[PDB]
Amino acid sequence: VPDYHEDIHTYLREMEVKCKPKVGYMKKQPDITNSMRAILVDWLVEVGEEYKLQNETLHLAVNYIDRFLSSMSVLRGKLQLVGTAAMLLASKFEEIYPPEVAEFVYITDDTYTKKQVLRMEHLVLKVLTFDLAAPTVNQFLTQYFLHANCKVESLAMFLGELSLIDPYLKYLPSVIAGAAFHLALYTVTGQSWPESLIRKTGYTLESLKPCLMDLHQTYLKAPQHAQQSIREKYKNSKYHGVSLLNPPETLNL
Amino acid sequence: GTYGVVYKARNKLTGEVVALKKIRLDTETEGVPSTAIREISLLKELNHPNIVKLLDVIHTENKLYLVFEFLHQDLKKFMDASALTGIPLPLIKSYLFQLLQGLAFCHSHRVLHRDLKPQNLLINTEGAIKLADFGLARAFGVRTYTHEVVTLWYRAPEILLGCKYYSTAVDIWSLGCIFAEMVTRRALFPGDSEIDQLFRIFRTLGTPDEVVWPGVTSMPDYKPSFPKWARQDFSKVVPPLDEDGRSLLSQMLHYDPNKRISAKAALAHPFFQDVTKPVPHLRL
Amino acid sequence: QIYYSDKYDDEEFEYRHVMLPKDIAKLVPKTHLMSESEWRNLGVQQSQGWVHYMIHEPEPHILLFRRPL
Amino acid sequence: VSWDSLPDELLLGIFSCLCLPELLKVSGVCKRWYRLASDESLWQTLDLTGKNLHPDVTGRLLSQGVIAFRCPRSFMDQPLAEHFSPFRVQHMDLSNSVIEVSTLHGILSQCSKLQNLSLEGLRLSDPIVNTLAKNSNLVRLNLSGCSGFSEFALQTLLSSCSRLDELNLSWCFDFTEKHVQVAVAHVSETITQLNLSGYRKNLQKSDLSTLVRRCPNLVHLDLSDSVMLKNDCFQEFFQLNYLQHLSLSRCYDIIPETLLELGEIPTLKTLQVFGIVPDGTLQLLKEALPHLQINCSHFTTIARPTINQEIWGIKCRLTLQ
Amino acid sequence: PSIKLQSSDGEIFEVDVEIAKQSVTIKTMLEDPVPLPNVNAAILKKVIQWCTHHKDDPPTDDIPVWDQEFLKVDQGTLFELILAANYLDIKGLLDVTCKTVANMIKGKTPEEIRKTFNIKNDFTEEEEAQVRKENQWC
Amino acid sequence: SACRNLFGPVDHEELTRDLEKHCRDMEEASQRKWNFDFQNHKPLEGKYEWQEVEKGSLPEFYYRPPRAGSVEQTPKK
């Protein structure tokens, strides 16, 4: 029933901007690199797929990671601890039967003790000001899918996760959601972005052209990346094994 | 007896009502409870007169202090004090007005309450009523969520028959139960256990089947060995209530969730388009 | 311990349900229904004619008897 | 490659690894696969626990060649309109299922090779039992709680059925002294286990004597809620040479300590006497006869298919979880 | 001892008698170089490999992962391998190949099944509705 | 396989010091705006009139804890 769908859409469109993290934050930090953000998120998605979690858990966890690093200096040895704390917070918020603190202090090979994780939790709740209900791309994808073949959505979510692997932090989550949805639609069946979505979100193809080509080139370069944890995860028939498809060479915009 | 210590703060303010709420925190077990996090995050995101406001969050090393907005009296004791005289009808209508406004706001901002009961409703000494207990709230985007909900006396047949999706039409049913016991000072469905609750609901509203509820015989926990009860007189269910309210209740306690009116749809009902604003009659 | 309920009925049968504590509850068969001999051996105290007529899956520790008029 | 060129035995060997939903799904591919979806070797053992269904659906399925049909507590409240051939079912479970009398009559008027039956809780009548007379191979039978039929029907059924191994004619709520009399008069001679509880004001020492003098091979017996069995009945059971599990629970006319004498029957193993023994005195009875088992199992076993989804030790392969 | 098996075109592969004993046909035959004109050498070598890995076996359902990886190839040779395993009548090999095909069919729709298996559909557009009618109670 | 090390151990006592110093922000403003010793659960000089209302007055929500014979007949109860 559409008694609230458009209202929630407008609300999320308003909220996605207030919590938007800074872009150039990574250079300010002394000892961390974008390569290192990629390594953290790689290990993080590995651990998440281990404990049989949900993808929105990962979305919110990496969002907390981003909004945190953009505001606090840290030494590299603490990045895993912070990532574990963020995943724990995401599980507590969204997931039904949250994996306990013991599992997360174990998976780190006990490089950290429980009390350190608890104090990091105190700190991260302090800095985040207890505002964890941030919007993510996945909600936009799911809302868009209402206007539907399982493979299309699997590919779209795949592209969204690929985007969060690494110029996308300049675009809004709605922007990246639209780009991934349209490119996946073209890849799977060649159809184009229908009018009703443009009426709904106001976004046109022309506005999303830059992120569209960024997503296309990253899609091309993805199969040869140094890390394929998302790829091997999406090699399973649960996601229909769709990670092995060919990246289209050039769009027909 | 009745252990606890609570503090107040009343100097210079229109909403001078405040109250401190402390919760114990066991440090080395699960850390902060999921309920606390859900309540804090989903609460400092909403602002409305028909909803209790939060003012600040105090996170110590082992204790959490919450600067809630104080209020006078809940609804259980309020009905109990006037259990023999009844409640004026315009007061009921205004209370229901504020309740439906709050429900529309909460469901518009993607939050489920899932814990409505007259112990979680608070009234002011002027006629304003606000909700509380957002500890069971969760941000829904419809997936499958937690399958243990509000309270046996105010659950809805969606959960009792163990359905897989319970999208935001359960709070409407809970509101129907609360309004009905408002009018009649009698809990409609005082269940003993879940099966007794189902039998009571049936005996009041007749046994469901395919005609009334589409796709009911395919629910996980339906067994046609059920009693063959028929929908009894609606007027005798709630005697002191008029025809317009009888209609509103009929489309407000209907089986099929899709055939159950939502908040904004209810906001424009005739019985409900007539709105007054009285004040409470007893001490708060 | 053994808690009984009132009688509620439609025009044709009269029903009753009974709640049992944990120790007796953990004996109820999950496969077949019961017979008067069986639930009397369990420890029910009631008349002749009551028939155990279904099992509610979510809560096994509640029994449901009916009998005609 | 042309996988339609596959030979039929290979295709059947493939299909013998599926589950019922998919087996149904593949049937709609091509006419050859439609034929091969039903080849009387895939449909050995069915299972429809609690599932609602329809008379024509179950008739078609049974006609396909089922052997062990397990359908307990399922609801069949619609009229059967089609005819069939004599079925091939050998074990049938229908316990507690809500079915119509006409539909049940129509269904049973086709099955003739029934090796094992159950009809617990249901309601029967004269045409049903008259048709059921044909089953001249019933090893077991179970008619607990049933009600409605007549004495001529009962005697004809029991006369026609000769090999009846175990009988559970319990708790029926319309019987008469005539019913129980003709029952014990015409009971077959190979009854290994038998139940006749409930019939408080209709069980008499004369009929019990008739039983113990006709059938010499009772191994499990119960006469619960019988209010006219005395210690003379006691010595009656003393003629029984194979009674291993007796249960006279809530038999009031029996004075507790004569139960000690029961220990004196040699081949006894258990004795469930719930209701009569005052508490604490159970230890007295144990000390009086410590070579037995008193009140160690509440539940019966006389022709109950399931006491473990396997009916009577058989495994159902086509199921629905 | 050993025995020299010749395929459809002369690739005589010598194999221990205790290995070829797996093939029941060859077993009952050595009871009382040979060409097997129904098997090309390509599949035959894989058959020999499977027998060797299983040469000392005791003698869903947990497909052994060795066979699983041995089975990680496309349609055509899977088809031919199943046919050859039948023709030589070696129990476990046909068992596991059948199970593999069964599981790969598991789940997909009739359209996908028809496409992947290259099955010529027939008697359609009026009867599929009827056969679907025969499947409500699912 | 997920059990891996990313960077090996690093000092943790400096981590405790750093986190507690980060948390040493919510001690001044707490007493400033709210004039209450939340750490010691004690009131202060005033400007927020601190009393102790007994639990019998306010609605319970503000202090709710988190989460031959032996006849076969019916003898009533």
UniProtKB/Swiss-Prot annotation, chain B:
InterPro entries: CDK, Kinase-like_dom_sf, Prot_kinase_dom, Protein_kinase_ATP_BS, Ser/Thr_kinase_AS. It is found in: Cytoplasm, Cytoskeleton, Microtubule organizing center, Centrosome; Nucleus, Cajal body; Cytoplasm; Endosome. Phosphorylated at Thr-146 by CDK7 in a CAK complex. Phosphorylation at Thr-146 promotes kinase activity, whereas phosphorylation at Tyr-3 by WEE1 reduces slightly kinase activity. Phosphorylated on Thr-2 and Tyr-3 during S and G2 phases before being dephosphorylated by CDC25A. Nitrosylated after treatment with nitric oxide (DETA-NO). Its cofactor is Mg(2+). Keywords: Acetylation, ATP-binding, Cell cycle, Cell division, Cytoplasm, Cytoskeleton, DNA damage, DNA repair, Endosome, Kinase, Magnesium, Meiosis, Metal-binding, Mitosis, Nucleotide-binding, Nucleus, Phosphoprotein, S-nitrosylation, Serine/threonine-protein kinase, Transferase. Mg(2+) binds at residues 120, 133. GO terms for cellular component: Cajal body; centrosome; chromosome, telomeric region; condensed chromosome; cyclin A1-CDK2 complex; cyclin A2-CDK2 complex; cyclin E1-CDK2 complex; cyclin E2-CDK2 complex. Pfam families: Pkinase (PF00069). The active site is at residue 115. The record marks 76-77, 152 as: CDK7 binding. GO terms for biological process: cell division; cellular response to nitric oxide; cellular senescence; centriole replication; centrosome duplication; chromatin remodeling; DNA repair; DNA replication. It is an enzyme of class 2 (transferase). Changing residue 3 to F: 2-fold increase in activity. The keyword Plastid does not apply. CDD domains: STKc_CDK2_3. The gene is CDK2.
UniProtKB/Swiss-Prot annotation, chain C:
The keyword Glycoprotein does not apply. InterPro entries: Cyclin-dep_kinase_reg-sub, Cyclin-dep_kinase_reg-sub_sf. One of its GO terms (biological process) is regulation of mitotic cell cycle. Keywords: Acetylation, Cell cycle, Cell division. One of its GO terms (cellular component) is nucleoplasm. One of its GO terms (molecular function) is protein kinase binding. The keyword Acetylation applies. Disulfide bonds: none annotated. It comes from the Eukaryota. Belongs to the CKS family. Binds to the catalytic subunit of the cyclin dependent kinases and is essential for their biological function. Forms a homohexamer that can probably bind six kinase subunits. This is Cyclin-dependent kinases regulatory subunit 1. It comes from Homo sapiens. The gene is CKS1B.
Curated annotation (Swiss-Prot), chain D:
Pathway: Protein modification; protein ubiquitination. It is found in: Cytoplasm; Nucleus. Disulfide bonds: none annotated. The modification Phosphoserine is found at residue 85. Keywords: Acetylation, Antiviral defense, Cytoplasm, Host-virus interaction, Immunity, Innate immunity, Leucine-rich repeat, Nucleus, Phosphoprotein, Repeat, Ubl conjugation, Ubl conjugation pathway. It comes from the Eukaryota. One of its GO terms (molecular function) is identical protein binding. Residues 308-321 are annotated as: Mediates interaction with IFI27. Part of a SCF(SKP2) complex consisting of CUL1, RBX1, SKP1 and SKP2. Component of a SCF(SKP2)-like complex containing CUL1, SKP1, TRIM21 and SKP2. Interacts directly with CUL1 and SKP1. Interacts with CKS1. Interacts with ASB2 which is the substrate-recognition component of a probable ECS E3 ubiquitin-protein ligase complex; ASB2 is likely to bridge the formation of dimeric E3-ubiquitin-protein ligase complexes composed of an ECS complex and an SCF(SKP2) complex. Interacts with the cyclin-A-CDK2 complex. (Microbial infection) Interacts with hepatitis C virus/HCV non-structural protein NS5A; promotes the ubiquitin-mediated proteasomal degradation of NS5A. This is S-phase kinase-associated protein 2. The lineage of its organism: Eukaryota, Metazoa, Chordata, Craniata, Vertebrata. The gene is SKP2.
UniProtKB/Swiss-Prot annotation, chain F:
Changing residue 74 to A/D: No change in PKB/AKT1- nor UHMK1-mediated phosphorylation. It comes from Homo sapiens (Human). Changing residue 48 to F: No change in binding CDK4 and no inhibition of CDK4 activity. Translocates to nucleus. No effect on in vitro phosphorylation of CDK4 by CCNH-CDK7. Forms a ternary complex composed of CCNE1, CDK2 and CDKN1B. Interacts directly with CCNE1; the interaction is inhibited by CDK2-dependent phosphorylation on Thr-74. Interacts with COPS5, subunit of the COP9 signalosome complex; the interaction leads to CDKN1B degradation. Interacts with NUP50; the interaction leads to nuclear import and degradation of phosphorylated CDKN1B. Interacts with CCND1 and SNX6. This is Cyclin-dependent kinase inhibitor 1B. Induction: Maximal levels in quiescence cells and early G(1). Levels decrease after mitogen stimulation as cells progress toward S-phase. It is found in: Nucleus; Cytoplasm; Endosome. Decreased levels of p27Kip1, mainly due to proteasomal degradation, are found in various epithelial tumors originating from lung, breast, colon, ovary, esophagus, thyroid and prostate. The chain holds residues 27 to 190 of 198 of the full protein.
